């Protein structure tokens, strides 16, 4: 909508207060005009019809319980946009400042969030397995990274290509969590998963087996469920990424860590220059090795650590 840019205030899913960019035109709308062609947050009103109604508020204050998922979806979309702009020189998910759209209050008791090819969608959770999923910055950045992948490598959502797709979203979801310095960790979804249980998460990059996900290619899932294990076999790639960044010994193979920033540069270059829709794990290794070579040299420690990491998880 056309109007005047301003700044409101509200509280997110976890009770924290934050300022959000809004637009005034009779109502105050969750429309951020400061980032690309805009960030727009919609109310799905517990229905499954999308996108719903652009979020409208009478006084530019968002402290109602109903408001919290919209505040965080709106705010964390902006943080993710800033990350890709400031760190990787990418303007929105298409590289041309495409508008970012999110709908909250999707359905009733829906324990998931997703990118649907055109926008982000967030359930509220059932209150036991999940609280509203936009409260997790790694969740939000995970979903928006699916849009980046769709517009770059185009990894198809099944088998090893799909597991790479999910791993990329976990990797940059975590890097965005570190970028915002919001209680950062190498876990996925810990802020919105099981509000009654402390210290757990949806999956772990540092130790995927902690939740029954493979940490080595010999333990990969080979069935047909989960589109061929896209959320399962991603643990193999997540572990390799964790090793590249932080280092460690895994199944007897030692990896010298090179840090998060270099991990992001290597995988972003692999994603945008070398991966294709049908890439498999072995091709991802070649892409990451070539990306590290482009950036740091064929004799560099960086290239060495990439090779060791994939060796450690059994990917040749
Ligand atoms: Ca209000
Ligand atoms: Ca965290
Ligand atoms: Ca996390
Ligand atoms: Ca929990
Ligand atoms: Zn995903």
Curated annotation (Swiss-Prot):
Cofactor(s) for this UniProt protein: Ca(2+); Zn(2+)
Binding residues for Ca(2+) 4? 193-194, 197, 200
- Positions with a binding annotation for Ca(2+) 3: 177, 183, 185, 190
Temperature dependency: Thermostable.
Record-listed E.C. numbers: 3.4.24.27
Q: From which source organism is this entry?
A: Bacillus thermoproteolyticus
What does this protein's record comment on cofactor binding? Binds 4 Ca(2+) ions per subunit.
Q: Cite the source lineage.
A: Bacteria, Bacillati, Bacillota, Bacilli, Bacillales
Task: List the catalytic residues.
Answer: 143, 231
Annotated residues that bind Ca(2+) 1 are located at 57, 59, 61
Name it.
Answer: Thermolysin
Listed A to Z, the keywords are: Calcium, Hydrolase, Metal-binding, Metalloprotease, Protease, Secreted, Signal, Zinc, Zymogen
């Amino acid at each position: 909508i056309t109007g005047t840019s301003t700044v409101g205030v509200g509280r997110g899913v976890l009770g924290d207060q934050k300022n959000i960019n809004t637009t005034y035109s009779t109502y105050y709308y969750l429309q951020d005009n400061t980032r690309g062609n805009g960030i727009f947050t919609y109310d799905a009103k517990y229905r499954t019809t999308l996108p719903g109604s652009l979020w409208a508020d009478a006084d530019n204050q968002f402290f109602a319980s109903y408001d919290a998922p919209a505040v965080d979806a709106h705010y964390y979309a902006g943080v993710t946009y800033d990350y890709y702009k400031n760190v990787h020189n990418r303007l929105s998910y298409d590289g041309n400042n495409a508008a970012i759209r999110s709908s909250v209050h999707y359905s009733q008791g829906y324990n998931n969030a997703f990118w649907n090819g055109s926008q982000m969608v967030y359930g509220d959770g059932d209150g036991q397995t999940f609280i509203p999923l936009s409260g997790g910055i790694d969740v939000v950045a995970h979903e928006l990274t699916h849009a980046v992948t769709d517009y770059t490598a185009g990894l198809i959502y099944q088998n090893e290509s799909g597991a790479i797709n999910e791993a990329i979203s976990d990797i940059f979801g975590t890097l965005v969590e570190f970028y915002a310095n919001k209680n950062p960790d190498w876990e996925i979804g810990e802020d919105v998963y099981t509000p009654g249980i402390s210290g757990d998460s949806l999956r772990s990059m540092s130790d995927p087996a902690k939740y029954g996900d493979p940490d080595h290619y010999s333990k990969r899932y080979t069935g047909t469920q989960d589109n061929g294990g896209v959320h399962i076999n991603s643990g193999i790639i997540n572990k390799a990424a964790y090793l590249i960044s932080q280092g460690g010994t895994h199944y007897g193979v030692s990896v010298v860590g090179i840090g998060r920033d270099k991990l992001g540069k290597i995988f972003y270059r692999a994603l945008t220059q070398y991966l294709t829709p049908t890439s498999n794990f072995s091709q991802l290794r070649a892409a990451a090795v070539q990306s590290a070579t482009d950036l740091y040299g064929s004799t560099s420690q960086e290239v060495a650590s990439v090779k060791q990491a994939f060796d450690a998880v059994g990917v040749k």
